[PDB]
Symmetry: D2
Subunit: 194 residues, 4 copies
């Protein structure tokens, strides 16, 4: 139910898995057997990131293997966000907005799902600044106006115009950048990273 109960359980499981008793694990970590027992009784909440790294190391695993998954924030399998709930970040250069990011619903049950409405306020394709690609795949859909999309190698990009209603898939690790089509003022798209 918490980081430390989650840890207590996963710690005990791993330790038993590798056939160590409290004393063996304690001897590897500069603690008493009693202290290791306390962790497994849910008293590990004040362990530091550094100490957790050492525990994972001596158990031949990662901190992730010893900590609980993200958790469940769903309501019988669903989560809903109303339109006046959306968080917003602005893409700014020299106190000029280039993008506004309208954050749509997210869930701990699918952490890589990041959907956004992007207001695209630059209509100078020169302004497009390449990222370096995502860990995951991405789906885009043009809601308003027309997008000038660039992808691949920032030095010699591939480019395309996407009118309203166009849809696109960008594979993991593919660098990309976009603005509105030259001189057309502004555009809007939905981007779903997953």
């Amino acid at each position: 139910k918490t980081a430390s109960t989650g840890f207590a359980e996963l710690l005990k499981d791993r330790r038993e898995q590798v056939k160590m008793d409290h004393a063996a694990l304690a001897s590897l970590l500069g603690e008493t057997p009693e202290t290791v027992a306390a962790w497994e009784n849910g008293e590990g909440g004040e362990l530091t990131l550094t100490q957790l790294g050492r525990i994972a190391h001596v158990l031949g695993t990662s901190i992730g293997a010893l900590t609980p998954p993200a958790g469940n924030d769903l309501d019988d399998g669903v989560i809903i966000q109303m339109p006046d709930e959306r968080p917003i970040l602005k893409g700014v250069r020299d106190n000029v907005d280039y993008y506004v990011y309208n954050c749509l619903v997210r869930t701990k049950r699918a952490p890589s799902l990041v959907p956004l409405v992007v207001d695209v306020l630059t209509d100078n394709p020169d302004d497009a600044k390449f990222n370096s690609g995502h860990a995951g795949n991405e789906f885009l859909f043009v809601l308003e106006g027309e997008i000038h999309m660039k992808w691949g190698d920032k030095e010699n990009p591939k480019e395309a115009l996407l009118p309203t209603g166009a849809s696109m898939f960008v594979e993991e690790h593919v660098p990309h950048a976009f603005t509105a089509a030259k001189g057309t003022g502004s555009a809007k798209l939905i981007a779903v990273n997953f």
Copy 2:
């Protein structure tokens, strides 16, 4: 480059993996060693689904392990669909349309990605017919009007109203159904199964 070259390569790999020569594999399948060799030389294109099932069985694996992945239809990591390319299926009951499905971009590199614009033509929540849930997760976003969403157990559903701009996540295997809000005529949403 084809089903049969893909198979030829995967067949040889598996057979070598389990330490069988052509003769051993041939003796399990009612063929000569030469025939099995021919398959590995790319001559398996006329093998039936049934015969493939038997080959997979005797090799202790699945037909999928012996056939190539979906393939690559991307253009330097991307695929784009223009708005007048979209395929359409209609949800019809007694020659009355309830839904129109406007199929957005798909790719063999991520087969479970199925994005749709759904025109919702029924505004009677009684008309909502539950599916039985998806293999994958689903993201929804209301583009026009207002949606009456139902989910969970069809006998005692959970329900919510989603106005324009609302967004929603439905976990794998969660049954759901939707119409437009009662009496409001019609609505439109984007649904991204992934």
Copy 3:
């Protein structure tokens, strides 16, 4: 068949519905009638060729593997045993005998072997090019001379009885018995 065609029948239907194609839509793309597509979804797809399956998977934007069922279940309440008398052998030809241990469709990548290592000249060790998966090894009898990495300048280890080893996916490796000791035996578990 029953399982392949019945499994194909169910997954075909699921996938078709998933991409919002009715029988008529799918049938047209394949040059078939809707009744033919219906017949496949009724379990009558057993005579479809590998090439035809490739085209169905293509039009459905997916793979043959996605439209076909997993390997079956050959376990007896979660377990499968192999008795020592029941091992298949393949004799890296004449100087290694491969005694195949238990395998299961529920974990097709698991391939455990007892390898009889009959060469004791490390100079003749022949490097493979690496496995697709990891490997665990345990020296059962004798003493093994293991080589790995770059065949031109390999890492090496002399491994007495009871030694154990892990070889990561794609790492080239070779073994012989230790120079002049005759023969050795290991258990190799590819997983």
Copy 4:
């Protein structure tokens, strides 16, 4: 530390950027200053407690594991060896001795053991409740009496030297040496 804090630093930044939060946004949600969040992303997060990490992961809609680096690499060009003299032991207490074979951070679920089985009374076999992963077993010495499934009415097998077995994830099982044969030995590979 270096690796945990440096790894946290990089993944924190990636995730923050991914969900479109600047330092100030993240800092406010955590009751911290933006300079503090900047300091973490500069490798100064080593003293963060398990509880504080839980809250950072919570606000970022993810897990601690997603914000922390994988287990390191302890391999020598793709390989790790363990010599027979180097086995850790745990003595299912007094009648099983567990001799730990080679393990690696590159495959943390791989736990191979030599199990010395010192009880030869099948009546006393104690059932575990099943593993999280699969298991491969090979009878090294003697003869094993294996039980599995329902402890109330188990499936059983007498397994002579050289027998091999696969036990699927979550299947309860127990073993002793065969009645009155004294002792036995197997290699168990959990993977």
